[PDB]
Amino acid sequence: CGKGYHLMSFPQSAPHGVVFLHVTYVPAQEKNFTTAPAICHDGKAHFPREGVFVSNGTHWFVTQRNFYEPQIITTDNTFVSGNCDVVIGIVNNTVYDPLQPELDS
Amino acid sequence: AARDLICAQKFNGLTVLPPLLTDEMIAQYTSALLAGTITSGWTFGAGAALQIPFAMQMAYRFNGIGVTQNVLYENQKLIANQFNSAIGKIQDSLSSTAS
Numbered sequence: 096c097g098k099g100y101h102l103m104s105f106p107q108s109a110p111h112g113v114v115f116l117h118v119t120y121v122p123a124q125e126k127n128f129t130t131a132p133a134i135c136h137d138g139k140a141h142f143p144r145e146g147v148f149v150s151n152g153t154h155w156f157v158t159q160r161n162f163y164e165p166q167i168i169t170t171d172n173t174f175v176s177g178n179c180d181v182v183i184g185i186v187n188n189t190v191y192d193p194l195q196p197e198l199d200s
Numbered sequence: 201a202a203r204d205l206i207c208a209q210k211f212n213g214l215t216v217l218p219p220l221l222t223d224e225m226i227a228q229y230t231s232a233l234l235a236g237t238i239t240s241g242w243t244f245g246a247g248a249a250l251q252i253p254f255a256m257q258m259a260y261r262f263n264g265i266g267v268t269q270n271v272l273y274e275n276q277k278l279i280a281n282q283f284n285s286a287i288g289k290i291q292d293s294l295s296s297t298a299s
């Protein structure tokens with residue numbers, strides 16, 4: 096159904112045949128980033144639920160794979176699995192907790 | 201020595217034509233497909249090739265079959281060793297049996 100990530104297709108009739116108009120999705124403008132497989136926070140290894148960890152140089156964000164939409168790393172979009180002594184390439188960062196400012200106010 | 205079969209085919213009007221792509225060109229295509237698979241994943245077949253580390257690409261592959269990606273990162277050396285052993289088994293089977 097065409098080259099790229101397929102979205103839709105439309106048929107057209109032709110003599111002794113058929114013509115398909117394949118509508119696809121093609122990524123356009125890439126950008127280099129620094130990435131890590133996991134985030135070490137409080138002695139716990141955090142992995143992204145959906146997406147990928149990226150860094151613009153100073154701060155770390157989590158974004159979806161096919162579109163650069165950076166978001167703050169939070170326990171909602173990450174899950175915890177084990178400690179930091181096993182994963183190769185794990186980096187140190189903080190993970191935001193939404194419950195603490197709601198409890199403080 | 202003696203007359204060949206190919207010479208007797210040639211002398212009677214039967215001719216074998218060479219293919220358009222040589223074996224070096226097929227090897228170039230195969231090496232390009234392998235390098236794009238290793239260094240980009242599936243991204244080079246749907247557009248431009250975007251680099252990704254091979255452990256993270258393999259975690260994407262594990263996530264595609266219904267296994268969480270901490271399973272790869274907590275068992276990375278075992279999976280690498282199993283892959284290397286299976287490639288060596290393919291080497292042994294190709295050097296041993298030709299059927």
Ligand SMILES: *[C@@H]1O[C@H](CO)[C@@H](O)[C@H](O)[C@H]1NC(C)=O
Nearest residue numbers: 124125126127128249250251
């Ligand atoms: C990323 O880095 C490579 C080498 O450092 C460079 O050739 C390339 O232009 C950079 N940008 C993109 C979008 O790939």
Ligand SMILES: *[C@@H]1O[C@H](CO)[C@@H](O)[C@H](O)[C@H]1NC(C)=O
Nearest residue numbers: 135137138179185186187188
């Ligand atoms: C991450 O933090 C721990 C303690 O918080 C420290 O022992 C370790 O060296 C740090 N890792 C890096 C790469 O700085």
